[PDB]
Amino acid sequence: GERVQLAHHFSEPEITLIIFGVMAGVIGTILLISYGIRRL
């Protein structure tokens, strides 16, 4: 980073990967819900 940075459990790659995984989960959830709707 720059200067002194507060240390987190998750590093930048780890936390960004987790956020992107949650985002992928939510996107897949909404897409599957859309697939289920419009068919019944």
Partner: protein, 517 residues
């Protein structure tokens, strides 16, 4: 392209199918002197806003985002968009609304003790989610409801704002260096002139006027019967570069008088090495980032998404008009995905998100327009000019020895040239001119020959009131509401105008392709 398939990501898939088959021609169509001239012209058109807005951003954010970040973001996003976008003539860069939002968000974060750069990261994360959903459900198809009415109100307003800011910069130069009988002949120069200097304001005015004049004359020459046709067209094609070179040399051979020059950052470094590095931790840099703000970042993300979406998609509509002879197609879904997703990713590196900018993109398209024998004949549709512009913006930090010799006033003349030439194809501007012409002189066009003169003037006047309202909103703290006020013109055209205009009148006055109903 604005049809709805009903298939998930269908509009995106269609965009790739439509334009990517032309990929080879999107390279070979660049082999022409007109494309190199366009590169040189749009390079300055893109560099100057980057430097100016980056300076303002650094001033207003304590250098958490500044010139270097904006330069690198512009370069990288432009390279990627040129290589992958469906409309490579769009120019991706920073804009005034984005600067206003950065101001507002920085102020909000200061009030609540938040790290502004981390909040930006979370806005970016929400931006990526929003664009994926919008593109997944083909949300870009709603652009089909933005008719020439709204397109031209937006385009005319942006052109007028561009001209107004160009003139305001010159007025500011006069404010800093007024005309006085006496000056303090010993004035500190570093970092900038600390007091009024003689000849500076008038010389800047002269340089601006001369650049504008030479550009306008060279444009007239390209059209004219002088010189052999091929020579006249190349000289005409390199009109803006030739004017820039002439006025830069004029300023260069005037050693004693000071003129403000372009200034790029020293190197490829963050603007504030004390504030942040290249990568921003979403959980916080100095303080743990609050959890509630991780969710609350969706609303600023919504506003940013609306701003970028409207600017970019109206720009795509304008540059892709059928009358402009674009025979390769554009991708509304793909371009939005690229611009917004790259912006969301850029937030992770403390870099600005961008939008396809109307004046720059229209200037770029016009510089690639080849004129028939009057009538537009074709456009040099290709990816090379935009890619090269982005690369030059990225390399600007290394070419300081060249850029430091270019006065801003020369670029002021070029900006005026862009602003005036951007008004050409706008029917609203054409109709505004008709307000000052006797009816017998009105051209043979359907909205003249099939609509009564006073009805056409009433139609123009209603549009003018919309411009007045929008300009007023621009000049208030609630200027971020501008996209919604602009959206209000779509109901105005579809709900209220038919109450006072007959159908045939509206087909004449608001025509997707300038047809006689």
């Amino acid at each position: 392209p604005l049809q709805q398939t009903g298939q998930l990501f269908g509009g995106l898939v269609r965009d790739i199918r439509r334009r990517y088959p032309y990929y080879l021609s999107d390279i070979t169509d660049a082999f022409s002197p007109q494309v190199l001239a366009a590169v040189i012209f749009i390079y300055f058109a893109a560099l100057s806003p980057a430097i100016t807005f980056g300076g303002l951003l650094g001033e207003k954010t304590r250098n958490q985002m500044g010139v270097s970040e904006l330069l690198i973001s512009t370069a990288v996003q432009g390279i990627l968009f040129a290589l992958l976008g469906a409309q490579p003539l769009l120019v991706v860069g920073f804009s005034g609304p984005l600067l206003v939002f950065e101001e507002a968000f920085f102020s909000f974060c200061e009030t609540n003790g938040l790290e502004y750069i981390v909040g930006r990261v979370w806005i970016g994360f929400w931006l990526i989610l929003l664009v994926v959903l919008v593109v997944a459900f083909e949300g870009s198809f709603l652009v089909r409801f933005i008719s020439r009415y709204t397109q031209e109100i937006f385009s005319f307003l942006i052109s007028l704002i561009f001209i107004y800011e160009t003139f305001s910069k010159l007025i500011k130069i006069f404010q800093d260096h007024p005309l006085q009988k006496t000056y303090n002949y010993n004035v500190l120069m570093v970092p900038k002139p600390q007091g009024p200097l003689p000849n500076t304001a008038l010389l800047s005015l002269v340089l601006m006027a001369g650049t504008f004049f030479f550009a306008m004359m060279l444009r007239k020459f390209k059209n004219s019967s002088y010189f052999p046709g091929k020579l006249r067209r190349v000289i005409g094609d390199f009109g803006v570069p030739i004017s820039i070179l002439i006025m830069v040399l004029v300023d260069f051979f005037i050693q004693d008088t000071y003129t403000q020059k372009l200034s790029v950052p020293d190197g490829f470094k963050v603007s504030n090495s004390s504030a942040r590095g290249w990568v921003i931790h979403p959980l916080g840099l100095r303080s743990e980032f609050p959890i509630w703000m991780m969710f609350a970042s969706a609303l600023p993300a919504l506003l940013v998404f609306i701003l970028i979406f409207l600017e970019s998609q109206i720009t795509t509509l304008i540059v892709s008009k059928p009358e402009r002879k674009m025979v390769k197609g554009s991708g509304f879904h793909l371009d939005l995905l690229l611009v917004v997703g790259m912006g969301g990713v850029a937030a992770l590196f403390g870099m600005p998100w961008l939008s396809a900018t109307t004046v720059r993109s229209v200037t770029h398209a016009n510089a690639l327009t080849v004129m028939g024998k009057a009538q537009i004949q074709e456009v040099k549709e290709q990816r090379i000019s935009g890619l090269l512009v982005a690369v030059l913006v990225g390399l600007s930090i290394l070419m300081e020895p060249i850029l430091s010799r270019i006065p801003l006033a020369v670029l002021f003349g070029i900006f005026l040239y862009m602003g005036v030439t951007s008004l050409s194809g706008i029917q609203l501007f054409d109709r505004i001119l008709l307000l000052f012409k006797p009816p017998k002189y009105h051209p043979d066009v359907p909205y003249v020959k099939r609509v009564k003169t006073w009805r056409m003037h009433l139609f123009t006047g209603i549009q003018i009131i919309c411009l007045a309202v929008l300009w007023v909103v621009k000049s208030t703290p609630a200027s971020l509401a501008l996209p919604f006020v602009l959206i209000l013109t779509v109901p105005l055209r579809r709900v209220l105008l038919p109450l006072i205009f007959r159908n045939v009148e509206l087909q004449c006055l608001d025509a997707d392709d300038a047809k006689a109903t």
